[PDB]
Symmetry: C2
Subunit: 323 residues, 2 copies
């Protein structure tokens, strides 16, 4: 039958998928990067404790978990997102640090004090409306979004749930990659009892402001007829780089290995969502990844600027020693 029955996240990137080569930095880009590193490596630096309630009178230094989040690639994502405008890059990183503090995820895990816990959001995922499973052609972990399986009413918890899953998919990043792939299925799921808007604006703000360069590819399917037409109509007018991220009306297998894809979309993975099995496995797997990540961070001096290639790897010597 060729189908592979699976019910838990795939812990590692298979050796069959190579890690895409990283685009090189120009002498000047390398110079701006050093400026960002210097700024955040300042032992006296203090940052706002909140984004929404930002106050020049309430600043706090970088904690250890924050220094571990301020990585080489974190700097690069912001540098590229702000089009290498040093001042904007610094400001954005600072505001995301403030937001992570206000939102309750600045500690890199509930085990370090995060207010956003697995138990807090677990109910939101009981119908499997979001699933982390598999990796695509460019080694990007896959996040399935199935709005047609909505099981709860509009609430702020829905936002915390989304942020939690995004942070988890990020934990699943293999060494050498920092972008994810979203597979969005708009189909209606009647088997899922439907529950009987402010959240939209907060979701948008978070996605556009605090997760720069995370969208590697977006695979769309079962798009509503009318929505499809509007996408086709505006498509010729979307910036080249962005349009290349959008994939639709194409074989998903063309972008995702067959054994890494849900059979529901042409792959070989016979996946059925079972909460009492999938959720505990996801949380634990993510936990082990961050434990390793944080342990490496400490073994390398616990300083700002370390590379995620090194933090997520096991090689003895640093591939990217800090200047």
């Amino acid at each position: 039958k060729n189908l592979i029955n699976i019910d838990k996240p795939i812990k590692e990137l298979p050796a069959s998928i190579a890690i895409p080569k990283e685009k090189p930095l120009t002498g000047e880009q390398q110079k701006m990067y050093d400026e960002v590193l210097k700024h955040f490596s300042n032992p006296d630096l203090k940052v706002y404790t909140s984004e929404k309630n930002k106050s020049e009178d309430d600043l706090k230094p970088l904690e250890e978990e924050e220094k571990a989040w301020l990585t080489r690639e974190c700097f690069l994502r912001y540098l590229r997102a702000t089009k290498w405008v040093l001042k904007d890059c610094i400001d954005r990183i600072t505001m995301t640090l403030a937001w992570r503090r206000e939102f309750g995820i600045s500690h890199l895990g509930e085990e370090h004090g995060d207010k956003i816990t697995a138990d807090l959001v677990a109910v939101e995922n009981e119908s499997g409306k979001q699933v982390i499973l598999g990796y695509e052609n460019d080694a990007r972990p896959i996040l399935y979004l199935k709005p047609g399986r909505q099981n709860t009413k509009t609430s702020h918890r829905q936002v915390q749930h989304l942020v939690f899953m995004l942070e988890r998919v990020i934990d699943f990043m293999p060494a050498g990659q920092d972008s994810l792939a979203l597979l969005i299925d708009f189909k209606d799921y009647p088997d899922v009892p439907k529950v009987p808007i402010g959240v939209g604006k907060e979701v948008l703000h978070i996605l556009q402001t605090h997760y720069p360069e995370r969208l590697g590819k977006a695979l769309l399917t079962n798009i509503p007829w009318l929505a499809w037409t509007f996408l086709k109509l505006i498509h010729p007018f979307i910036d080249p780089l962005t349009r290349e991220k959008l994939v639709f009306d194409e074989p998903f297998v063309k972008y995702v290995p067959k054994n890494e894809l849900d059979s529901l979309y042409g792959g070989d993975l016979k996946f059925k969502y079972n909460h009492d099995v999938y959720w505990p496995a996801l949380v634990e797997t993510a936990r082990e990844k961050r434990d390793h990540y944080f342990k490496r961070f400490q073994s390398f001096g616990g300083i700002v600027g370390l590379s995620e290639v090194d933090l997520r790897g096991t090689h003895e010597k640093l591939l990217y020693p800090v200047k």
Copy 2:
């Protein structure tokens, strides 16, 4: 209290809305335009009789009603849409002529032989899912699209209906304007009985109606869809996103006395098919009769200006270069 009950299309652009003056052409654009004019003014020109069934062995000369469609502004719309690439402009105009013939609308009206008649598509508009009414700040006639009021099963007739309405809003273009404004309401309408096409509609819109979308005002957008629009919006080229309007008071773009009260305007409009449809069709018909009569009075030649065809002044504002 300050509302106005209305149940039929507004026939003329009010004197209170000025027609935006057009930008003059550069010496180079002018040169290219003359090229288009020369090509389509060729007395020996023959063009395909169909787009989908295009055949080099089946070419027919331009009929009188087609020369009337090949206006100065028709050439310019295609020139602008093809980024002033002569070869592309000429090819596109030719395929649209071929498409209009195959689709059944190459005669400028059922009165001249159009296969697409008002009677043919009338039922598609019974629930008022599309309405032509009013003009906005830039004198663009307004076309309302209420997909939540769908009253029929999917079919090619729905396509014919859409094309018919587009051709009608074009008949409503005031002299000096050739772009329309679309007001789309995605709200669901339960009070309306419920129940490739999508691909055909896309092809027509993207290929045979260049530069017609002046403004697209959107409202009652679904939450999830709204998020995607906001997310991709920063990456849409400037000119295109300026055309899109949402999360803004429509009155900012449409005079209140030209806007449906459901969206903040003062027009209290209720769709009554037996009243609205006959008026729309007749008004459009009268506009087409005038347009064609003017065309004939000016020699019935290719290249005439829609400003002159839709106006009443005696002397031409845009004489055709001999």
